[PDB]
Amino acid sequence: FSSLSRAILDLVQFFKWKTVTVVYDDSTGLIRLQELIKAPSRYNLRLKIR
Amino acid sequence: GVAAIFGPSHSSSANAVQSICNALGVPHIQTRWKHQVSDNKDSFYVSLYPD
């Protein structure tokens, strides 16, 4: 998930999004998507984690 | 022959000692935080570090 989190981040820029709503199921899923959560630090996304 | 095991104090090591202490019956007293997965059916452990 160092590569899968960069692949999901390429689809939220090819589709030109600004507000995503990342939904996981268990607490390990934050580690599986930590390259997507750190994205508003440099890009123009707006995360709402549920 | 012991009565309690006071933790190896690390997330990769405490999960291995917890499943031993759950098996043999002896309590396992933890003093640090540990990622406890949702389907870990263990009962012989306490954690004194604040959740």
Swiss-Prot record, chain A:
It is found in: Cell membrane; Postsynaptic cell membrane. Highest expression is found in the olfactory lobe, piriform cortex, dentate gyrus, hippocampus, granular cell layer of the cerebellum, and in caudate-putamen. Sumoylation mediates kainate receptor-mediated endocytosis and regulates synaptic transmission. Sumoylation is enhanced by PIAS3 and desumoylated by SENP1. It comes from the Eukaryota. The postsynaptic actions of Glu are mediated by a variety of receptors that are named according to their selective agonists. This receptor binds domoate > kainate > quisqualate > glutamate. It does not bind AMPA without coexpression with GRIK5. Homotetramer and heterotetramer with GRIK5. Tetramers may be formed by the dimerization of dimers. Assembles into a kainate-gated homomeric channel that does not bind AMPA. Can form functional heteromeric receptors with GRIK4 and GRIK5. Can form functional heteromeric receptors with GRIK3. Interacts with DLG4. Interacts with NETO2. Interacts (via C-terminus) with KLHL17 (via kelch repeats); the interaction targets GRIK2 for degradation via ubiquitin-proteasome pathway. Belongs to the glutamate-gated ion channel (TC 1.A.10.1) family. GRIK2 subfamily. Ionotropic glutamate receptor that functions as a cation-permeable ligand-gated ion channel, gated by L-glutamate and the glutamatergic agonist kainic acid. L-glutamate acts as an excitatory neurotransmitter at many synapses in the central nervous system. Binding of the excitatory neurotransmitter L-glutamate induces a conformation change, leading to the opening of the cation channel, and thereby converts the chemical signal to an electrical impulse. The receptor then desensitizes rapidly and enters a transient inactive state, characterized by the presence of bound agonist. Independent of its ionotropic glutamate receptor activity, acts as a thermoreceptor conferring sensitivity to cold temperatures. Functions in dorsal root ganglion neurons. This is Glutamate receptor ionotropic, kainate 2. The chain holds residues 153 to 202 of 908 of the full protein.
